[PDB]
Amino acid sequence: RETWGKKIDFLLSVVGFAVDLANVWRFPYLCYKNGGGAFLIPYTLFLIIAGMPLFYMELALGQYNREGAATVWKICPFFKGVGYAVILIALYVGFYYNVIIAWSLYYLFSSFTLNLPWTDCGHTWNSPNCTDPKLTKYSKYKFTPAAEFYERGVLHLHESSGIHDIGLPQWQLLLCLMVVVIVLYFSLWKGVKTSGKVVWITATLPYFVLFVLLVHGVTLPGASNGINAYLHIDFYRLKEATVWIDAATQIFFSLGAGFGVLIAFASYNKFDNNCYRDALLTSSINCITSFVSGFAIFSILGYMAHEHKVNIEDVATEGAGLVFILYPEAISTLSGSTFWAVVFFVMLLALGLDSSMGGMEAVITGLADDFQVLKRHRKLFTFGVTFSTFLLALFCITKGGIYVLTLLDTFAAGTSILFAVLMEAIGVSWFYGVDRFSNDIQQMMGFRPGLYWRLCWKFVSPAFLLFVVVVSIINFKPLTYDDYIFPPWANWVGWGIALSSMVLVPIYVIYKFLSTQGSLWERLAYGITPENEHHLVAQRDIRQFQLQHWLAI
Amino acid sequence: RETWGKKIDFLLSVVGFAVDLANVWRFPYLCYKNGGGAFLIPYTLFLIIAGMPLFYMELALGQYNREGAATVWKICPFFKGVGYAVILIALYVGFYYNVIIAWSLYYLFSSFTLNLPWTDCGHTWNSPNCTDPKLTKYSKYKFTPAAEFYERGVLHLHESSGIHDIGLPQWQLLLCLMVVVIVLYFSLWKGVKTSGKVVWITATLPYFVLFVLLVHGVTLPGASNGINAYLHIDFYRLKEATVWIDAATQIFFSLGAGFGVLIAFASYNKFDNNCYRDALLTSSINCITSFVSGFAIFSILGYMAHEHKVNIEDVATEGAGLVFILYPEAISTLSGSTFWAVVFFVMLLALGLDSSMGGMEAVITGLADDFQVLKRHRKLFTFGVTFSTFLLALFCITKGGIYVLTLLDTFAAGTSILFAVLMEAIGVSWFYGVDRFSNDIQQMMGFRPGLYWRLCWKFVSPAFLLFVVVVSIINFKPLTYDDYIFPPWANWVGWGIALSSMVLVPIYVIYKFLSTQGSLWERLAYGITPENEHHLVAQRDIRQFQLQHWLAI
Ligand SMILES: CCCCCCCCCC(=O)O[C@H](COC(=O)CCCCCCCC)COP(=O)(O)OC[C@@H](O)CO
Ligand SMILES: CCCCCCCCCC(=O)O[C@H](COC(=O)CCCCCCCC)COP(=O)(O)OC[C@@H](O)CO
Ligand SMILES: C/C=C/c1ccc(OC[C@@H](O)CN2CCN(Cc3ccccc3)CC2)c(OC)c1
Ligand SMILES: C/C=C/c1ccc(OC[C@@H](O)CN2CCN(Cc3ccccc3)CC2)c(OC)c1
Ligand SMILES: CC(C)CCC[C@@H](C)[C@H]1CC[C@H]2[C@@H]3CC=C4C[C@@H](O)CC[C@]4(C)[C@H]3CC[C@]12C
Ligand SMILES: CC(C)CCC[C@@H](C)[C@H]1CC[C@H]2[C@@H]3CC=C4C[C@@H](O)CC[C@]4(C)[C@H]3CC[C@]12C
Ligand SMILES: CC(C)CCC[C@@H](C)[C@H]1CC[C@H]2[C@@H]3CC=C4C[C@@H](O)CC[C@]4(C)[C@H]3CC[C@]12C
Ligand SMILES: CC(C)CCC[C@@H](C)[C@H]1CC[C@H]2[C@@H]3CC=C4C[C@@H](O)CC[C@]4(C)[C@H]3CC[C@]12C
Ligand SMILES: CC(C)CCC[C@@H](C)[C@H]1CC[C@H]2[C@@H]3CC=C4C[C@@H](O)CC[C@]4(C)[C@H]3CC[C@]12C
Ligand SMILES: CC(C)CCC[C@@H](C)[C@H]1CC[C@H]2[C@@H]3CC=C4C[C@@H](O)CC[C@]4(C)[C@H]3CC[C@]12C
Ligand SMILES: CC(C)CCC[C@@H](C)[C@H]1CC[C@H]2[C@@H]3CC=C4C[C@@H](O)CC[C@]4(C)[C@H]3CC[C@]12C
Ligand SMILES: CC(C)CCC[C@@H](C)[C@H]1CC[C@H]2[C@@H]3CC=C4C[C@@H](O)CC[C@]4(C)[C@H]3CC[C@]12C
Ligand SMILES: CC(C)CCC[C@@H](C)[C@H]1CC[C@H]2[C@@H]3CC=C4C[C@@H](O)CC[C@]4(C)[C@H]3CC[C@]12C
Ligand SMILES: CC(C)CCC[C@@H](C)[C@H]1CC[C@H]2[C@@H]3CC=C4C[C@@H](O)CC[C@]4(C)[C@H]3CC[C@]12C
Ligand SMILES: CC(C)CCC[C@@H](C)[C@H]1CC[C@H]2[C@@H]3CC=C4C[C@@H](O)CC[C@]4(C)[C@H]3CC[C@]12C
Ligand SMILES: CC(C)CCC[C@@H](C)[C@H]1CC[C@H]2[C@@H]3CC=C4C[C@@H](O)CC[C@]4(C)[C@H]3CC[C@]12C
Ligand SMILES: CC(C)CCC[C@@H](C)[C@H]1CC[C@H]2[C@@H]3CC=C4C[C@@H](O)CC[C@]4(C)[C@H]3CC[C@]12C
Ligand SMILES: CC(C)CCC[C@@H](C)[C@H]1CC[C@H]2[C@@H]3CC=C4C[C@@H](O)CC[C@]4(C)[C@H]3CC[C@]12C
């Protein structure tokens, strides 16, 4: 297998992997939808007890097994079905993640203008309802130039009444997505890249942009209200279950657990990489980045509330287009809006593409370790993955493609990834054993995990994942894009898409049971024991059939 | 490879293969849409000059190459891309052919009743507009019990305004299609069947049913008008180009040319089977069956026109549901309608399933000869093909699935199959050579083809195929289900589906050119010469680069 270069394996380079589109785009709107302040406590809790333990576990598993997202379960075939699952989950992300980058690309095409299109009204897409503060509603107040440009000048949402009538893909977004998938193909057709300019620029540009945004927000008039709202904890929202689900999903998106990216990345690392320090640094940097991003978001929200004289909770939307409304307007206030807008759009395109490459690599590395034919047909396989994503994403660039994008973001990567990571934790801590995992970590790095890590991997994280799965399944809420209630059939289609990845585990356990020849004992042994230890099936020496294995702790 | 049993290889068994759903369902409505009488001349002409020559050519090619639908082009790689094409074309058929059988299955569920649901009004699905002759419009007159039961009680077309709002799949049609695909899987998971009861009953039941229908129609009052209309030739319709396209498509559907069924069937035949006599008998029996089916259809049309006092051209629809309106009502007139209806529905289910098995075999035999992995994973591969068809066909059992079914029947199997068979004829008669084909036929059967067959394979059939392709592309007409004009985007989607199979040829020639290593000369030689004769590329002895090859005649 290949190995990453010294540039990306540096101690000060992991921060480059810490940045992701979820922390720049998804975390802002998730926190705004959850109120702000009431979302940081569940986020930090799931990071310290669930996110970081699963992060370390996936890193160690990928470093040990030296396999992709699916084959990494060579120690227990009965859980191999979850691998493909997360792969499909990653594929689901490609159905919408690539759609967002192209959006920023269109903004790039709107960035080379003296007068920015999101500054004032009077353009073609601007409806008569467009309101310019320099020159109406307490529900969402979508009558701002930045919102009119995003909904009518980019997505053309005014030409669609709902998800039932999506329309036709806009030619602008069509060409943008074509350029995006072409770059994605030409940046991955030669396998992994030891060192690249793309991963190098994503380590300094995002932090600089966030610092500039913070310095601008702390000086904007009226941002004090947003700052105070961000530092206010609403316990009645903590009593609700949606906040915890959103925090878990955001943690899994930011850290990458549940997509196969971590295992694929660790499969090409060295046999002595200290994943403990890497996990600590990643968690800390991600928490700090999320905190400062939420602070800047609430500062911009307070500024817009002061400028438009609208309430903070009703000044902008709570969907996937929030960062395309708040961030641009602030750039309009800074001197030289053109240069800052260009820099911000280039940063978005960079982090967006770096995330798509990481996610697509997880799909390929896994499917090639499954089928060695695809290992040699990389350029043809890459094309298939990218081209399939481009097509199945043509749905999200239609006049009403934002609805399908939100549906995929809510259901395709909702309870499915939670169930996947729960099955992974169960298969690693119970079926495989915490003792064997600790011995592997010791023989790889030189030290055994403490009581805390093992108790989290075996008891804390699985229990919390089961809890969030239960509250996601039972306490379900209908999807609404802040104004439009999705019809019941849309929710049924979303649940079916989620089940498409969820039921991959029992389907595989059924297949692994029928394909295996022998009695029930032999079938169960071949399904729960590692391949290289299959000889122990002949000697009738199975650890999982002993009480000491499940009581290892 | 396997060999067919003596029961299906008998001289009096080829008639069993002569019967098909196209001659029982598609030919009736195609002839009714084209007027009747003006359609038999183009049909017979395309059968005698285009249909039978291509039939014999495909039979001989499949018997010689001993390969599937795609690999049969081992003599010329540059045309291998057409193989997959026709395979996909066959797959396109599976998107709607399986939907029709299930319909008859529902009729079977409606056949075990004393009072047939298509006899009178008063039921739940029957709208207030239902008219019973025993107890309105000159456009289509869809107010008959048999039409109300088909459009509202089976397809539920009243719950859909157009193709834009298809709706949700009916649970009745859902279970019917599930049973159909289950039977299709359990009847093909063990490869080809040397002898089967299904292919045995399809050789006597269809002819008996057609004879009974003829005897009933010749005695029905008012059928004389339909008989006279069927024996009337409208030359102004022959001047039009749509009649010729419909005749060519019906010939290709009845004979199987353009789907890979003939090549796959001949691949398992013996090395001495006289495909000349088989082609003659098949063409004759198919022509006689089409003639008698059209005669019975026009007799029933005249009877219904006399009973309802409506014009013959406006008494029924011109879509895929004509045979579900004309044939049932006649059964209502015969004594013991229950038994005859059950027999007719069982015959339809039989011929319908026999055609789906033949078409699916063409897809599998071909894809397995392409990839020997799928040869061993037959039950898993079969499942994939059948399951994919079942899903992609869920679209045609929706409230407005008849529109998508008609779109697929018109575009997915329209100009695409014409271009495919044209490319096949060009690759066999010009690139491969008529002389080599004649030598192969001589060494297989013992006699060389006459001047007529070679002139048809080289000059007549390719010219007529080019002509019908030109008149299909230039002289295009918008699709209408006899009342509803399909929107332009529907026609664009149909043309895109057709191009999906059409452009598979240049895509493959491009791939075969890039993958081949060497200069332009070596690439062209490896792309136009047979694999086993690739050594001739080294000796620089290429027949296609000689004037005598293209002037073989
Ligand atoms: C939403 C319902 C889908 C039901 C479709 C159910 C087939 C189940 C075959 C199956 O499970 O075989 C796998 C290998 O097959 C694969 O690729 C992935 C199969 C997963 C298909 C999901 C597609 C979803 C869009 C397991 O094969 P293996 O025995 O582990 O290894 C074989 C070779 O790949 C490497 O050894
Ligand atoms: C509607 C646009 C599709 C563009 C997608 C374009 C890929 C083109 C690969 C290609 O052409 O490789 C083939 C083998 O690949 C296949 O299966 C069938 C590929 C056809 C895909 C059509 C799917 C349509 C739903 C040829 O491979 P080969 O070199 O002849 O043999 C390889 C092995 O199969 C047997 O030797
Ligand atoms: C020693 C370990 C270092 C380390 C630290 C942090 C990392 O980041 C991990 C995250 O950013 C991974 N994203 C998560 C979101 N996407 C998912 C996706 C899926 C499909 C298409 C597009 C996007 C994928 C990207 C990382 O992974 C390379 C490695
Ligand atoms: C020596 C030769 C004897 C012979 C004579 C006539 C034959 O019939 C040939 C035709 O009926 C073939 N149909 C054509 C229509 N369908 C297409 C289809 C595709 C996909 C799904 C369902 C249906 C496929 C079926 C034949 O092929 C077995 C062999
Ligand atoms: C085709 C293979 C790759 C699987 C594709 C999975 C995803 C992309 C599919 C599964 C179900 C699909 C949805 C089903 C129905 C509708 C309603 C329609 O009015 C717009 C498209 C929309 C919203 C589809 C978008 C794409 C979708 C979400
Ligand atoms: C199976 C997947 C991976 C590949 C094939 C996907 C194809 C069949 C899908 C993907 C996106 C789809 C398009 C999405 C939206 C529209 C706009 C609508 O007004 C007409 C149909 C049209 C133009 C669809 C045609 C079919 C389409 C191109
Ligand atoms: C090969 C099949 C399965 C999939 C084809 C996918 C691509 C080629 C198709 C699917 C939907 C298509 C789009 C549908 C509608 C429009 C709007 C109009 O401005 C024409 C171009 C444009 C923008 C089309 C471009 C091509 C398109 C994106
Ligand atoms: C020789 C051994 C390793 C077998 C190799 C078989 C490989 C090449 C086959 C078997 C399973 C196949 C996959 C099964 C299903 C799908 C989903 C479909 O939407 C796109 C193609 C794709 C992704 C196939 C690609 C080719 C594939 C990976
Ligand atoms: C709509 C979008 C997704 C289409 C993308 C098409 C891409 C995948 C295709 C189109 C043309 C292709 C190229 C055509 C020819 C060559 C030269 C050959 O020596 C190496 C491969 C290479 C360089 C191909 C790589 C893949 C390629 C760039
Ligand atoms: C599911 C939808 C998106 C279609 C996906 C098509 C993909 C999976 C298909 C299209 C063409 C295929 C390739 C065609 C031929 C070969 C050569 C063979 O020796 C190994 C497999 C390989 C390399 C195939 C891999 C899978 C492949 C790339
Ligand atoms: C219910 C459907 C839609 C989803 C789940 C289907 C699963 C359970 C089915 C579908 C096809 C099945 C396979 C078909 C054939 C074989 C070969 C046989 O020698 C062993 C069992 C095995 C390998 C089956 C295992 C179970 C299987 C994979
Ligand atoms: C997914 C892979 C297997 C390819 C599928 C090809 C066929 C089945 C696809 C290609 C384009 C599709 C059509 C594209 C758009 C529409 C309009 C929508 O209002 C109803 C469905 C309908 C009419 C689709 C039916 C299915 C369709 C015809
Ligand atoms: C790629 C192919 C072979 C397999 C996957 C096909 C899937 C994605 C398609 C095939 C038929 C589709 C369904 C067809 C019609 C409807 C009714 C509509 O009101 C909601 C969506 C729904 C329920 C679709 C959901 C997605 C669907 C199930
Ligand atoms: C796995 C994904 C990709 C495809 C799933 C396809 C099957 C399982 C889905 C697709 C559309 C679904 C149908 C959509 C709507 C209805 C109407 C209502 O009476 C509920 C059942 C029924 C009839 C569903 C049954 C299941 C169904 C047929
Ligand atoms: C070892 C050699 C022979 C390579 C074998 C690779 C085979 C198993 C692979 C390569 C090409 C693949 C196909 C490529 C594309 C598609 C279309 C998709 O909608 C369903 C899966 C399907 C039909 C794949 C099935 C698996 C497949 C046939
Ligand atoms: C919705 C429809 C299409 C689902 C069809 C599912 C079919 C393909 C699946 C479901 C259950 C499967 C069976 C489950 C178990 C066995 C026993 C094994 O020793 C041989 C295969 C066999 C007999 C499988 C054959 C394929 C099978 C019948
Ligand atoms: C394109 C849509 C309909 C999905 C189609 C999925 C089909 C093509 C996939 C699903 C599971 C796949 C199988 C999974 C694993 C193996 C074992 C390998 O050693 C040879 C290929 C084989 C036997 C694959 C053949 C292709 C396959 C059957
Ligand atoms: C334009 C797109 C959408 C359709 C047509 C794509 C065709 C022309 C492209 C897509 C991917 C391409 C392949 C990608 C990579 C390679 C490997 C290289 O060593 C030889 C050429 C070859 C084998 C290319 C041949 C041409 C190819 C098959």
Side-chain angles (χ1 to χ4, degrees), chain A residues 1-5 12-197 199-553, chain B residues 1-5 12-197 199-553:
Chain A
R1 302 180 63 90
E2 292 78 10
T3 56
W4 297 93
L12 284 75
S13 180
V14 66
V15 292
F17 303 94
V19 186
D20 189 70
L21 179 60
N23 296 118
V24 184
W25 152 74
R26 231 177 72 91
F27 186 86
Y29 80 82
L30 283 188
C31 182
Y32 179 57
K33 182 180 60 61
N34 288 124
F39 184 78
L40 300 179
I41 301 179
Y43 184 90
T44 305
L45 181 59
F46 199 88
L47 180 60
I48 61 180
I49 75 182
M52 185 178 59
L54 295 182
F55 194 88
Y56 194 15
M57 183 189 67
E58 293 188 10
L59 283 192
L61 201 68
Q63 184 181 357
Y64 184 82
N65 292 261
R66 297 295 189 177
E67 295 292 337
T71 49
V72 68
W73 297 97
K74 59 182 180 181
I75 51 188
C76 188
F78 276 164
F79 285 90
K80 286 263 299 181
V82 324
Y84 306 138
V86 312
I87 295 179
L88 187 54
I89 294 176
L91 188 59
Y92 287 163
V93 185
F95 294 163
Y96 58 90
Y97 244 37
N98 297 117
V99 188
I100 307 174
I101 321 165
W103 293 351
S104 300
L105 182 58
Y106 187 86
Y107 278 86
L108 181 61
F109 296 153
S110 299
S111 62
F112 300 98
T113 53
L114 192 148
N115 180 269
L116 287 313
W118 58 84
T119 303
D120 52 353
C121 307
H123 300 74
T124 301
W125 59 90
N126 288 127
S127 59
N129 299 301
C130 186
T131 65
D132 182 59
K134 331 169 189 304
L135 259 52
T136 73
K137 197 55 202 68
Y138 50 89
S139 69
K140 286 300 168 180
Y141 192 71
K142 302 181 303 299
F143 296 155
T144 60
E148 297 281 43
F149 176 77
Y150 174 77
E151 299 179 359
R152 301 174 61 97
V154 174
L155 301 183
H156 297 67
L157 189 59
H158 62 282
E159 301 179 359
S160 60
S161 300
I163 192 180
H164 58 277
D165 49 334
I166 49 179
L168 299 181
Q170 298 289 155
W171 60 275
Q172 309 89 341
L173 299 180
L174 177 64
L175 296 180
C176 291
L177 187 59
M178 286 180 60
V179 173
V180 166
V181 301
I182 284 300
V183 172
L184 182 63
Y185 171 76
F186 279 90
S187 60
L188 292 178
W189 61 350
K190 288 183 173 59
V192 298
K193 273 69 181 61
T194 62
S195 59
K197 187 248 190 180
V199 304
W200 291 353
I201 59 179
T202 51
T204 172
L205 296 180
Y207 299 150
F208 175 80
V209 169
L210 290 180
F211 180 81
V212 171
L213 289 177
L214 288 175
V215 173
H216 183 49
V218 297
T219 59
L220 282 177
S224 60
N225 301 121
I227 294 177
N228 295 16
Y230 179 80
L231 299 180
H232 185 47
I233 289 86
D234 300 2
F235 297 93
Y236 77 97
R237 305 192 63 89
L238 274 76
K239 297 178 180 59
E240 301 180 0
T242 306
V243 181
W244 303 91
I245 305 168
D246 295 330
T249 53
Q250 178 62 215
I251 284 294
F252 286 152
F253 263 89
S254 60
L255 299 181
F259 306 100
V261 183
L262 303 180
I263 301 179
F265 184 83
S267 60
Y268 298 102
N269 287 10
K270 300 180 300 180
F271 205 76
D272 53 354
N273 177 268
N274 186 277
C275 296
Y276 171 75
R277 173 203 61 179
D278 298 2
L280 289 180
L281 267 61
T282 301
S283 299
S284 59
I285 295 300
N286 189 266
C287 181
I288 296 300
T289 302
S290 60
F291 187 83
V292 301
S293 181
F295 194 87
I297 283 294
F298 268 78
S299 300
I300 299 180
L301 285 166
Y303 169 75
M304 289 185 56
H306 176 266
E307 291 291 337
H308 300 73
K309 292 85 180 60
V310 198
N311 300 330
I312 303 179
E313 295 79 8
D314 301 321
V315 75
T317 61
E318 302 178 357
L322 183 60
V323 299
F324 300 94
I325 300 179
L326 308 187
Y327 290 148
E329 293 190 13
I331 302 179
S332 299
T333 310
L334 285 171
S335 302
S337 299
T338 300
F339 175 79
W340 293 104
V342 168
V343 170
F344 175 74
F345 298 157
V346 168
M347 175 217 62
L348 277 188
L349 293 179
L351 54 89
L353 285 173
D354 283 57
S355 67
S356 293
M357 285 191 303
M360 290 296 177
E361 152 203 59
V363 173
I364 306 178
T365 295
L367 295 185
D369 296 6
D370 191 9
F371 306 105
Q372 268 66 5
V373 170
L374 305 177
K375 301 205 70 175
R376 307 169 319 175
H377 303 273
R378 188 67 163 64
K379 294 184 173 56
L380 188 55
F381 184 34
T382 305
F383 164 85
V385 183
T386 58
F387 186 80
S388 63
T389 274
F390 167 85
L391 299 184
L392 298 180
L394 283 177
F395 277 123
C396 317
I397 64 179
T398 53
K399 327 285 186 177
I402 180 61
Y403 299 150
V404 185
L405 184 138
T406 305
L407 185 70
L408 294 179
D409 194 12
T410 303
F411 291 82
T415 318
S416 60
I417 181 180
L418 304 177
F419 179 80
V421 299
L422 175 59
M423 292 295 101
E424 291 180 0
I426 292 300
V428 171
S429 300
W430 300 87
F431 286 79
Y432 177 67
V434 294
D435 54 330
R436 298 179 60 90
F437 202 78
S438 300
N439 292 15
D440 296 357
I441 294 185
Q442 179 186 7
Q443 76 178 39
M444 287 185 301
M445 310 175 186
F447 67 99
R448 294 182 57 89
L451 290 168
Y452 174 79
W453 292 93
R454 280 181 280 98
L455 287 180
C456 290
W457 296 341
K458 190 175 181 62
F459 298 98
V460 180
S461 299
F464 274 88
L465 289 175
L466 181 60
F467 178 80
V468 301
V469 165
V470 166
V471 306
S472 305
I473 293 180
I474 300 299
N475 299 90
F476 172 75
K477 299 181 60 181
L479 182 61
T480 58
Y481 189 69
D482 309 314
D483 291 310
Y484 166 81
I485 302 181
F486 279 81
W489 69 267
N491 300 120
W492 281 108
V493 169
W495 277 100
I497 292 179
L499 290 180
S500 299
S501 295
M502 289 181 60
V503 309
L504 290 183
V505 194
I507 290 180
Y508 187 92
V509 180
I510 288 171
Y511 169 88
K512 190 61 194 186
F513 186 82
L514 294 179
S515 299
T516 302
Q517 296 80 5
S519 60
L520 176 62
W521 180 276
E522 300 182 4
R523 294 170 189 264
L524 291 180
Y526 283 145
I528 71 188
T529 55
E531 302 288 340
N532 59 274
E533 296 182 359
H534 276 359
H535 60 270
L536 300 180
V537 178
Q539 304 177 0
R540 297 189 63 179
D541 189 7
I542 309 301
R543 50 170 60 258
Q544 293 80 8
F545 291 154
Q546 301 178 177
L547 77 164
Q548 60 180 179
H549 171 88
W550 309 91
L551 273 63
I553 320 178
Chain B
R1 302 180 63 90
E2 292 78 10
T3 56
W4 297 93
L12 284 75
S13 180
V14 66
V15 292
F17 303 94
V19 186
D20 189 70
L21 179 60
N23 296 118
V24 184
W25 152 73
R26 231 177 72 91
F27 186 86
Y29 80 82
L30 283 188
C31 182
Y32 179 57
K33 182 180 60 61
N34 288 124
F39 184 78
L40 300 179
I41 301 179
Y43 184 90
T44 305
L45 181 59
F46 199 88
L47 180 60
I48 62 180
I49 75 182
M52 185 178 59
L54 295 182
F55 194 88
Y56 194 15
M57 183 189 67
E58 293 188 10
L59 283 192
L61 201 68
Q63 184 181 358
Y64 184 82
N65 292 261
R66 297 295 189 177
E67 295 292 337
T71 49
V72 68
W73 297 97
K74 59 182 180 181
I75 51 188
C76 188
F78 276 164
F79 285 90
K80 286 263 299 181
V82 324
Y84 306 138
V86 312
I87 295 179
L88 187 54
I89 294 176
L91 188 59
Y92 287 163
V93 185
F95 294 163
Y96 58 90
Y97 244 37
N98 297 116
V99 188
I100 307 174
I101 321 165
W103 293 351
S104 300
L105 182 58
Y106 187 86
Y107 278 86
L108 181 61
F109 296 153
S110 299
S111 62
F112 300 97
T113 53
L114 192 148
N115 180 269
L116 287 313
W118 58 84
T119 303
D120 52 353
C121 307
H123 300 74
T124 301
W125 59 89
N126 288 127
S127 59
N129 299 300
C130 186
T131 65
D132 182 59
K134 331 169 189 304
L135 259 52
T136 73
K137 197 55 202 68
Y138 50 89
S139 69
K140 286 300 168 180
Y141 192 71
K142 302 181 303 299
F143 295 155
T144 60
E148 297 281 43
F149 176 77
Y150 174 77
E151 299 179 359
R152 301 174 61 97
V154 174
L155 301 183
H156 297 67
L157 189 59
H158 62 282
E159 301 179 359
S160 60
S161 300
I163 192 180
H164 58 277
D165 49 334
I166 49 179
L168 299 180
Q170 298 289 155
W171 60 275
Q172 309 89 341
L173 299 180
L174 177 64
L175 296 180
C176 291
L177 187 59
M178 286 180 60
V179 173
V180 166
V181 301
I182 284 300
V183 172
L184 182 63
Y185 171 76
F186 279 90
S187 60
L188 292 178
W189 61 350
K190 288 183 173 59
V192 298
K193 273 69 181 61
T194 62
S195 59
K197 187 248 190 180
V199 304
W200 291 353
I201 59 179
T202 51
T204 172
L205 296 180
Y207 299 150
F208 175 80
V209 169
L210 290 180
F211 180 81
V212 171
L213 289 177
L214 288 175
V215 173
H216 183 49
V218 297
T219 59
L220 282 177
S224 60
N225 301 121
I227 294 177
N228 295 16
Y230 180 79
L231 299 180
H232 185 47
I233 289 86
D234 300 2
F235 297 93
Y236 77 97
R237 305 192 63 89
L238 274 76
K239 297 178 180 59
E240 301 180 0
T242 306
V243 181
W244 303 91
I245 305 168
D246 296 330
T249 53
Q250 178 62 215
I251 284 294
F252 286 152
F253 263 89
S254 60
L255 299 181
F259 306 100
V261 183
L262 303 180
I263 301 179
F265 184 84
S267 60
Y268 298 102
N269 287 10
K270 300 180 300 180
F271 205 76
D272 53 354
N273 177 268
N274 186 277
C275 296
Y276 171 75
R277 173 203 61 179
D278 298 2
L280 289 180
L281 267 61
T282 301
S283 299
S284 59
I285 295 300
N286 189 266
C287 181
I288 296 300
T289 302
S290 60
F291 187 83
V292 301
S293 181
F295 194 87
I297 283 294
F298 268 78
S299 300
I300 299 180
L301 285 166
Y303 169 75
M304 289 185 56
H306 176 266
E307 291 291 337
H308 300 73
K309 292 85 180 60
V310 198
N311 300 330
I312 303 179
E313 295 79 8
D314 301 321
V315 75
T317 61
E318 302 178 357
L322 183 60
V323 299
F324 300 94
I325 300 179
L326 308 187
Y327 290 148
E329 293 190 13
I331 302 179
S332 299
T333 310
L334 285 171
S335 302
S337 299
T338 300
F339 175 79
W340 293 104
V342 168
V343 170
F344 175 74
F345 298 157
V346 168
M347 175 217 62
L348 277 188
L349 292 179
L351 54 89
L353 285 173
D354 283 57
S355 67
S356 293
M357 285 191 303
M360 290 296 177
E361 152 203 59
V363 173
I364 306 178
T365 295
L367 295 185
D369 296 6
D370 191 9
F371 306 105
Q372 268 66 5
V373 170
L374 305 177
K375 302 205 70 175
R376 307 169 319 175
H377 303 273
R378 188 67 163 64
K379 294 184 173 56
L380 188 55
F381 184 34
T382 305
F383 164 85
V385 183
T386 58
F387 186 80
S388 63
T389 274
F390 167 85
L391 299 184
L392 298 180
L394 283 177
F395 277 122
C396 317
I397 64 179
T398 53
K399 327 285 186 177
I402 180 61
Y403 299 150
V404 185
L405 184 138
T406 305
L407 185 70
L408 294 179
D409 194 12
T410 303
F411 291 82
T415 318
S416 60
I417 181 180
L418 304 177
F419 179 80
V421 299
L422 175 59
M423 292 295 101
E424 291 180 1
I426 292 300
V428 171
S429 300
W430 300 87
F431 286 79
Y432 177 67
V434 294
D435 54 330
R436 298 179 59 90
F437 202 78
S438 300
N439 292 15
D440 296 357
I441 294 185
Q442 179 186 7
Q443 76 178 39
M444 287 185 301
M445 310 175 186
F447 67 99
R448 294 182 57 89
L451 290 168
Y452 174 79
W453 292 93
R454 280 181 280 98
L455 287 180
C456 290
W457 296 341
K458 190 175 181 62
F459 298 98
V460 180
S461 299
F464 274 88
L465 289 175
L466 181 60
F467 178 80
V468 301
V469 165
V470 166
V471 306
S472 306
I473 293 180
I474 300 299
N475 299 90
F476 172 75
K477 299 181 60 181
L479 182 61
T480 58
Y481 189 69
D482 309 314
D483 291 310
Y484 166 81
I485 302 181
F486 279 81
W489 69 267
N491 300 120
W492 281 108
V493 169
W495 277 100
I497 292 179
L499 290 180
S500 300
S501 295
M502 289 181 60
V503 309
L504 290 183
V505 194
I507 290 180
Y508 187 92
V509 180
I510 288 171
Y511 169 88
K512 190 61 194 186
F513 186 82
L514 294 179
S515 299
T516 302
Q517 296 80 5
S519 60
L520 176 62
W521 180 276
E522 300 182 4
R523 294 170 189 264
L524 291 180
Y526 283 145
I528 71 188
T529 55
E531 302 287 340
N532 59 275
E533 296 182 359
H534 276 359
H535 60 270
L536 300 180
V537 178
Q539 304 177 0
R540 297 189 63 179
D541 189 7
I542 309 301
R543 50 170 60 258
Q544 293 80 8
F545 291 154
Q546 301 178 177
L547 77 164
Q548 60 180 179
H549 171 88
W550 309 92
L551 273 63
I553 320 178

